[PDB]
Design a protein around this nucleic acid. Sequence first.
DNA 1: CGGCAGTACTG
DNA 2: CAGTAC
DNA 3: GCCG
Length: 322
Amino acid sequence: DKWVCAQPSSQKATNHNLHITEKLEVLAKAYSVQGDKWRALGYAKAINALKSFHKPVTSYQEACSIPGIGKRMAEKIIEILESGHLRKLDHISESVPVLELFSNIWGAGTKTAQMWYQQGFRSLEDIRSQASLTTQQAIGLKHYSDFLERMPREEATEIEQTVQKAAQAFNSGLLCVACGSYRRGKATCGDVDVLITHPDGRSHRGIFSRLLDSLRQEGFLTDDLVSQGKYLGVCRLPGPGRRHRRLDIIVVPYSEFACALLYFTGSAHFNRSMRALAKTKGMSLSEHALSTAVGRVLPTPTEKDVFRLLGLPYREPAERDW
DNA sequence: CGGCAGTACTG
DNA sequence: CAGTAC
DNA sequence: GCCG
Ligand SMILES: O=c1ccn([C@H]2C[C@H](O)[C@@H](COP(=O)(O)NP(=O)(O)OP(=O)(O)O)O2)c(=O)[nH]1
Ligand SMILES: [Cl-]
Ligand SMILES: [Cl-]
Ligand SMILES: [Cl-]
Ligand SMILES: [Cl-]
Ligand SMILES: [Mg+2]
Ligand SMILES: [Mg+2]
Ligand code: NA
């Protein structure tokens, strides 16, 4: 009950504290872009706890009883109830909107955004004309609007099928699965996360590099962000009315398929919760394996096996959307 | 008092 | 390594 | 920010 990975994410669909969480999310984002990662994490978990709670919180004692809600978070909750506003919202640093603008460049995080801000930059025009940009950041800036748009899941299907058909031309036995938000059933997707493997345990070897050359040669790939080991990049379906879309690809041996599928399906906060739980049980969970701590690799032929070994009820991908 | 997921790319 | 991202 |  203290573990989100032990609960269905559909509990959030009936948020009875939206007036609270809408204001806390503003603070959470402010701490995040300013680099206060751990304070922001605490806010993120408190927001999920509030979103999934069964009733509107009405008392300081009720709030404190909720896991992920402590004294400080309770005090903020009582303020929004009594007064309808949260004073701290009127005292967020004026740098935050600009820091958010900059850190939405792919490849630029809090450290780069703060440095640019200290150098006097305030707009993407300033970044374009005056900032020093890595190769990655230049692609991010070129695709600034593209990378902030989410595509309809129907388009993600088309992208998945494009990768799959190019892969299976090399070996008809290859398996390709779109993971991430697509597999969790969301109506829109920030990118497409394609997992590739081969049931024979070995014929996945070598195809990653040939697959990319195939997709480049047919013009499907339009920019590469990372292209050693795994692929993070940019694609565009052919024809009119098409946008550049983010595409990630990972190729894994079949022996790791369940753990890779689990990792790549997420959500990110679901994974972090499941991994933290594994740690408390003397185990370690990664996209490669569930193992004992420093270790023995535990047998996980299917996703269900990972849940069972952690003592968790199985959750379909749609219920992992934390 | 100290962790807060685990891994992997770039330069 | 620090910074960034999945 | 929260929690053990
Ligand atoms: O910090 C992270 C980020 C992602 N992941 C895993 C889970 C996530 O679902 C998967 C793909 O990452 P994306 O950034 O593509 N996120 P997702 O597909 O969930 O949402 P969207 O792409 O629609 O924003 O990688 C993590 O484990 N930790
Ligand atoms: Cl939500
Ligand atoms: Cl499925
Ligand atoms: Cl290869
Ligand atoms: Cl043991
Ligand atoms: Mg995704
Ligand atoms: Mg992705
Ligand atoms: Na960024």
